[PDB]
Amino acid sequence: GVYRVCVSTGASIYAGSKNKVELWLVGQHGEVELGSCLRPTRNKEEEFKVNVSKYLGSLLFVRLRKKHFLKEDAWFCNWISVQALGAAEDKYWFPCYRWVVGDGVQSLPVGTGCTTVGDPQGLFQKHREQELEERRKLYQWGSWKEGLILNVAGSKLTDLPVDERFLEDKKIDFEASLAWGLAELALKNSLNILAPWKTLDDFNRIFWCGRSKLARRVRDSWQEDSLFGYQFLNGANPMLLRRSVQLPARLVFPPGMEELQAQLEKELKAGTLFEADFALLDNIKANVILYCQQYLAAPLVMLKLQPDGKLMPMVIQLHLPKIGSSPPPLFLPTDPPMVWLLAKCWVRSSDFQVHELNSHLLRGHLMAEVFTVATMRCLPSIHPVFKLIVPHLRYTLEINVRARNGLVSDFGIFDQIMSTGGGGHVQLLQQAGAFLTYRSFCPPDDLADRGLLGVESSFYAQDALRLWEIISRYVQGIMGLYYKTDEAVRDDLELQSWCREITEIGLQGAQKQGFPTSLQSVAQACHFVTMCIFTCTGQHSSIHLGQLDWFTWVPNAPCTMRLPPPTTKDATLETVMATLPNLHQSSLQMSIVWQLGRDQPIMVPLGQHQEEYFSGPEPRAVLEKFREELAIMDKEIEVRNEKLDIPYEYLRPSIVENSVAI
Ligand SMILES: [Fe+2]
């Protein structure tokens, strides 16, 4: 048989190897020796024809060995393909996409994919058991802080497996751009070092972060209650807002407040009353920067949806009611300018804290990390489900360790400017585990329980729904090719351990929240994987992407507050200024909002990954349909935003990354 064996080397910097690599072809019936054929050239696809007398049959594996003489050289193998030039057979695909190190003999299965149940021959059975044992030695759980959901084991990036590390081409650009980014900002902001700081207009002096079309709008009108409430719907953090069924029990009224109660009852029966509650911030210890006391608040904001499709704030309560003590003052738009302005600033500051911590870090980065480690420890390379998820898990462990090394680590970024940093952030993050429910990660159920379905004013809910349907079908499409009966899913030990690693191990008992302990059906499994895929794409991008727009104008998103939240209604121009961050803190904030949210040097759009793990044409068809539905969504949304005054685009397949990486 005449075969053209083709081996593809990585496009990295250290991908090429000076060592000679020997291959072997082992099929359904027998195996053949090929020996040293070529030497891995960096970013070079190399093919060659060979002829073997021994009958192989269906090629199952392609074993390789990298022999080194005196100095070993790492080799990042993309894949190996061996096709029969004579017989009418399909090209045998053998995906690798990882680093190859050591004088150990590696084995690459064919890219078809299958499970233990779907492999009755037991051809790949022994292969996957030995691989997973090694996977577990490489991927272990760790604990950055006690009480939180597990993360990857280790402390530094060096503790991460080489395959999870940044490619040398991205690592240099990721760090360079970040360095030049914050320095440029630090330079210009140092000029204001002696500039007056007594009017809110002075905030415009430091403003020079990104200055986008939307970001300018914010500067133009942040004091507008219309934009204020608009952010609860389509802002950077649309997770807290929900439709009110009844008045919040913490919404207690001070003696005299009876007229306002009727305005609240009017909106409730109409079904236009909404509430965003920040009680999670209660009793969280605030930061201490330079021995100066910072302050937090647990506000409540009541809003009404206007017939012209506008959400407007009605009342803001800054403290939670103290049992046994008189009720705290409620602030209304009727209050003096400065008094209402201060209360909105406290709400924006608190939204920032919860956004970055819960919405972003926890619900986005850490959750994904949980999925990542559970995938690598329970699902073998050949597993069909494993091949579906991996692109979405790209560069996740790396960016997370980078965060726990200076972004949220002790004496890190939060501690330096964030009011929650310095202890309270962990307190807020640890206690936020209870709010992590299975339904909250699924749009069809999230907006359902909250009550944002059908709300035309909420573009997030719409886009979240549409996107979820597309993904859902893609997973259903892939899972359908490998799971035809519910018993298949039910008896998939690997699949069952994966789901176990997540709900029970990773998430520390998430069954009490809503996460399943076992996937017994096919439709249930499809919903779980979609939930995973969505968390590493949509859930993160819908929260990450708005940072450059809303958190750049400090007055709209204060990183900290120098004065405690007002207990009386007598705020003045100076007090608002004193409460808000000074030039020292605000400027640092802007330079840091660029870190937690920005455009990545090289970015991979949702569903647009290059690594090919499947070999069949059927899996590909499903992949192509997925890319098709996404493309048409990205265009339609683009057209829709034309008519929109403030275009919502945080869920567009073109800018929505395929994995959590920034
Ligand atoms: Fe992010």
Contact indicator for 284, 313 with CB cutoff of 8 Å: no
Backbone angles phi, psi at 154, to 5 degrees: 125, -175
Tell me, rounded to whole angstroms, the distance of Cα 38 from its chain centroid.
40
Q: Ligand 1 mean position to 87 CA, how many Å?
A: 50
Extract the annotated binding site: 360, 365, 540, 544, 662
Q: 500 — phi, psi (to 5°)?
A: -75, -45
Q: Is the dihedral of CA 106, 110, 114, 117 positive or negative?
A: negative
Alpha helix (H) ranges present in 295-366? Answer: 337-354
Residue 503, exposed/middle/buried by CB under 10 A (0-12, 13-18, 19+)?
A: buried
**Two tokens, residue 279:** 């009680």
Residue 307 class from Cβ within 10 Å (0-12 exposed, 13-18 middle, 19+ buried)? exposed
**Interacting residues of 540 by C-beta distance below 8 A, sequence separation 6+:** 360, 364, 365, 368, 657, 660
In three-state form (DSSP H/G/I as H, E/B as E, the rest C), the secondary structure along 436-484 is: CCHHHHCHHHHHHHHCCCCCCCCHHHHHHHHHHHHHHHHHHHHHHHHCC
Rg (CA), the chain: 28
Q: 329: which residues sit within 8 A by CB, 6+ positions away? A: 254, 317, 567, 568, 569
Residue 195 burial class via C-beta count within 10 angstroms: exposed 0-12, middle 13-18, buried 19 and up: exposed
**Sequence ranges of the binding site for Fe cation:** 360, 365, 540, 544, 662
User: What are the b/e assignments for 621-654, b being 16+ CB within 10 Å?
Assistant: ebbeebbebbeebbeebeeeeeeeebebbbbbbb
Q: Which residue's structure tokens are 């760790």?
A: 142
Cα 422–Cα 423–Cα 428 angle in degrees, nearest 5: 120
**654 CA to centre of ligand 1 in angstroms:** 17
66 bridge partner residues: 21
Which one-letter DSSP state was computed for residue 562?
Answer: S
C-alpha of residue 544 to centroid of ligand 1, in Å: 5
Which residue's structure tokens are 């002075």? Answer: 202
Instruction: Report helix, strand or coil for 578.
Output: helix
Distance 601 CA to ligand 1 centre (A): 14
Q: What are the CB-based long-range contacts (under 8 Å, 24+) for 227-231? A: 227/646, 228/313, 228/344, 228/347, 228/348, 229/301, 229/303, 229/310, 229/311, 229/312, 229/313, 230/310, 230/311, 230/646, 231/351, 231/550
Q: What is the C-alpha to C-alpha distance for residues 567 and 61, in angstroms, rounded to an integer?
A: 72
Cα 440 to middle of ligand 1, angstroms: 19
The whole-angstrom separation of Cα 551 and Cα 557 is 5
Assign 386 to helix, strand or coil. Answer: helix
608 CA to centre of ligand 1 in angstroms: 19
Distance 595 CA to ligand 1 centre (A): 9
Cα–Cα distance for residue pair 364/396, rounded to 1 Å: 10
**Cβ neighbours of residue 234 under 8 Å, at least 6 residues apart?**
457, 458, 459, 460, 646, 648
> Which amino acid is present at 327?
P
Report all structural domains of the chain as residue ranges with CATH numbers, in order of start. Answer: 1-111 (2.60.60.20), 112-238+352-659 (1.20.245.10), 239-351 (3.10.450.60)
Which whole-number Å values give the CA distances from 142 to 393, 408, 410, 517, in the listed order?
18, 16, 17, 22
> CA nearest 252: which of 142, 327, 312, 336?
327
What CA–CA distances, in Å, run from 526 to 6, 221, 475, 495, 522? 35, 44, 6, 12, 6
Say if CB 581 and CB 562 are below 8 A apart: yes
Residues 6+ apart with CB under 8 A from 117: 488, 491, 492
Give the count of beta carbons closer than 10 Å to the beta carbon of residue 187: 10
Question: What separation in Å is there between the alpha carbon of 364 and the centre of ligand 1?
Answer: 7
Q: Distance between CA 490 and CA 488 in Å, rounded?
A: 5
* 507 neighbors 196 (Cβ within 8 angstroms): no
Distance 400 CA to ligand 1 centre (A): 9
- In eight-state DSSP terms, residue 123 is T
Final resolution, Å: 2.4
Identify the three-state secondary structure at position 11.
coil
Q: What is the DSSP letter of 105?
A: P
User: Where on the phi/psi map is residue 611: left (φ > 0), alpha (ψ -120 to 50), or beta?
Assistant: beta
Distance 241 CA to ligand 1 centre (A): 21
Q: Which amino acid is at 108?
A: L
**Interval between CA 494 and ligand 1 midpoint (Å):** 30
Phi, psi of 330 (to 5 degrees): -100, 140
Round to whole Å and give the CA distance between 360 and 619.
32
Q: Which amino acid is at 175?
A: E
Which technique was used to obtain these atomic coordinates?
X-ray
Distance (angstroms) between ligand 1 centre and the Cα of 146 equals: 23
Residue the block writes with tokens 């003696």: 255
Measured in angstroms, how far is the CA atom of residue 86 from the centroid of ligand 1?
Answer: 50
The structure tokens listed for 630 are: 């996404």
Q: Within 10 Å of residue 225's Cβ, how many Cβ atoms?
A: 16
Rounded Cα–Cα distance for residues 367 and 587 (Å): 31
**Residue 216 CA to ligand 1 centre (angstroms):** 22
Tell me how far the alpha carbon of residue 322 lies from the centroid of ligand 1, in angstroms.
36
CA distance 105 to 77: 14
CA of 634 to the centre of ligand 1 (A): 21
Q: Closest Cα to residue 222, out of 367, 347, 387, 103?
A: 347
Q: What angle do CA 504, 113, 91 make, to 5 degrees?
A: 160
Classify residue 597 by its DSSP letter.
Answer: S
Q: Are 358 and 435 in contact (CB under 8 A)?
A: yes
Distance (angstroms) between ligand 1 centre and the Cα of 404 equals: 13
Q: Which helix (H) or strand (E) holds 657?
A: none
Tell me the CA–centroid distance for residue 44 and ligand 1, in Å. 33
CB 108 within 8 A of CB 98: no
Structure tokens at 51: 């002829």
Torsion from C-alpha of 366, 614, 4, 29, nearest 10 degrees: 110
Task: Please state the separation of Cα 272 from the chain's center in Å.
Answer: 31
Alpha carbon 496 to chain centroid distance? 24
Q: Are strands 31-38 and 20-27 parallel, antiparallel or unpaired?
A: antiparallel
DSSP class of 558: -
CA angle 7, 32, 104 (to 5 degrees): 60
What b-and-e string marks burial along 155-178, b requiring 16 or more CB atoms within 10 Å of the CB?
eeeeebbeebbbbeebbeebeeee
Strands 2-9 and 75-84: antiparallel
Count of CB atoms situated within 10 Å of the CB of 140: 14
Distance 78 CA to ligand 1 centre (A): 28
CA of 399 to the centre of ligand 1 (A): 9
CA of 367 to the centre of ligand 1 (A): 12
In this structure, what is the dihedral angle of CA atoms 63, 68, 74, 76, given to the nearest 10 degrees? -30
Dist. CA 144 → ligand 1 center (Å): 18
The residues near 224 (Cβ < 8 Å, ≥ 6 apart) are none
**Do residues 462 and 633 make contact, with C-beta atoms less than 8 angstroms apart?**
no
The CA distance from 72 to 68, in Å, is 5
Residues 253-292 as b/e (b if ≥16 CB within 10 A, e otherwise) read: beeeeeebeeebeebeeeebbbbbbbebbeebebbebeee
Instruction: Please state the separation of Cα 250 from the chain's center in Å.
Output: 32
Q: Which residue has the tokens 């608002």?
A: 576
Q: How remote is the CA of residue 518 from the centroid of ligand 1, in Å?
A: 30
As a whole number of angstroms, the distance between CA 642 and CA 332 comes to 34
State the distance from the centre of ligand 1 to the C-alpha of 596, rounded, in angstroms. Answer: 6
User: Under a CB-based contact definition with an 8 Å cutoff, are residues 328 and 319 in contact?
Assistant: yes
Closest CA to 492 of 515, 469, 524: 524
The Å distance, Cα 536 to ligand 1 centre, comes to: 10
**Backbone phi, then psi, for 34, in 5-degree steps?**
-110, -40
- How far does CA 431 lie from the centroid of its chain? 20
Residues around the ion ligand 1 (C-beta < 5 A): 544
Helical axes 367-378 vs 493-500, angle rounded to 10°: 150
Among the listed residues 60, 64, 53, the one whose alpha carbon sits nearest the alpha carbon of residue 26: 60
One-letter amino acid for residue 571 of the chain: A
Dihedral Cα 416, 422, 426, 429, nearest 10 deg: -50
Q: Ligand 1 centroid to 656 CA: how many Å?
A: 11
Q: Strands 300-306, 92-100: parallel, antiparallel or unpaired by DSSP?
A: unpaired
Pair of tokens at residue 425 = 């952030």
- Report residue 104 CA to chain centroid gap: 36
Q: Do 215 and 553 touch, CB atoms closer than 8 A?
A: yes
Question: Which DSSP state fits 514?
Answer: T
CA of 218 to the centre of ligand 1 (A): 21
Question: How many angstroms separate the alpha carbon of residue 607 from the centre of ligand 1?
Answer: 18
